[PDB]
């Protein structure tokens, strides 16, 4: 089973995420998905330098229909976390496009919209960009502990066997940063909020940083085994309007993502991520990304 | 370089892949713009030093009312608020301040835009912020190549865009106008009909002779000569928007005289000969403003 092309690429410069609801017959998604994955292959051949990839992924209700109820055992609608502190905006379809070249991504996004046509209702379209020094707009480097290299990224993100082999679970969550609130914090206070130093990007020892620090919330182990995810997140927005991080992660099980969210939003131990001092999530959804062979076998 | 006037760095660069434009109104006393503009151009120099490979430039430019105040009424003789053209076919949304940032790196442009906002602070009310991107093959989102006849090279671009002498030497006039394309409407037109609308062939970008295209074609509207002398402008326009939402062309041009821009607008919008640009069949302008970009030396004499 071959993995969709947008899960594994590293260090992308730009992305487009489109989140949409199904308005028409669920069966219209079958032909549209095949059209789109062929478009992606054609664009990769036309723009080899772009290192383009893309993913089509499906919400719980749609995917149960498309799959006949087989597999994707962990899939569910995204719930609130923290009783609502993390909101839920579960849609039916996610299209994630990434590459070195925003302009290529834009053409690919137009192709996705042509493939799905008026069967879908676009609810969100976000254009991500890698910022200076791969920093989040807060000024902290983002991506350091992300699984590195195809071998490890496959291990973390790609389902190994059975009916879902080559697929992955996806989580997307848009955050809105209040950089004015951030900038009122001293740099040492910001560093204790994240759990790494700001300029030099060195981890602060877990025994010496707050348990509410981001790293303490999300660097989770189960009897010594890390709960890893493959992030594809990027900055987005305008300088004068809304801006933040579009969080996007892939994992061979939803479990690892969910444990991190239960931790961040106070459900596990009553403590909340210190980043909520300056940024907040405003969307959230879970999706299942089938393998390419599974997509071809739809219609 | 005493006794000379240095152009702001964003007027002349060619083939930059990314831009940010910010348009804003002044909220309080115009004096706030003096120290903010000096800070901003200094920040630009710092970003150029930090990111030499970005090939970054930027411009700060001013609307008529605030430029008249800051200049004491000296110079900028052609400057005026952007008029409506075609009785409203081209709307007017004249603001007080234009920031234009362009480079080979969107991420550097973003940092520079943040610096501009920090410099001006609450003295301004941002009315729009547009992130331009060069599309594939330098095409407009309509699919036609954009930029072919734009003045080429530093020498010619300086001749067209940069005022040569007098108090305004090193300055330029700026026009910005955001267009919203209806690509569904465009795609209802056959490609031959689109070519007659533009005046060039779509795939190969060959000019269609003036006698073989309608007078409403875009090239017939805007390729204007006065007794054989072309009325040139230096465009810095780029595509913008989302695939599923608003998208189009953010039109931006610089010229040493506002006259050349105005003649093209009077032509496009029906004021000269009663005919209008065929591109209005699929796209429309929704903003419009004129600004004056002083020389970099003069931004330093503010205060
Ligand atoms: C505003 C939103 C977020 C910001 C700004 C942010 C920022 C960061 C930063 C600066 C780091 C440290 C550098 C690195 O290793 O990448 C980090 C690490 C990490 N983040 Fe986040 N993050 C956000 C949301 C999330 C969410 C929602 C999750 C999971 C559901 C998450 C999971 C992780 C993980 C697993 C790590 C690596 C921890 C480690 O093993 O050291 N992050 N994040
Ligand atoms: C929807 C907005 C616009 C679109 C899509 C558009 C597109 C084009 C295209 C495809 C060309 C031919 C290729 C080239 O030489 O660049 C062109 C040329 C040109 N455009 Fe536009 N344009 C727009 C607005 C404007 C405006 C508002 C003006 C002036 C006020 C203008 C002035 C020019 C000029 C002077 C030329 C060169 C003509 C020549 O000498 O051959 N354009 N434009
Ligand atoms: Mg660790
Ligand atoms: Mg000509």
Author numbering:
A (entry chain A): 2 to 300
B (entry chain B): -2 to 300
Share the article's original sentences:
The enzyme investigated in this work originates from the human pathogen Klebsiella pneumoniae and belongs to class B. All structures exhibit a dimeric ferredoxin-like fold typical for dye-decolorizing peroxidases, composed of antiparallel β-sheets with four β-strands connected by α-helices.
Interestingly, the crystal structure of the variant D143A/R232A is similar to the WT structure. It is noteworthy that crystals could only be obtained with the addition of 5% glycerol. We propose that this glycerol replaces Arg-232 in its role to stabilize the WT-like conformation of the loop comprising residues 142–148. The E°′ value of D143A/R232A was calculated to be −0.299 ± 0.010 V.
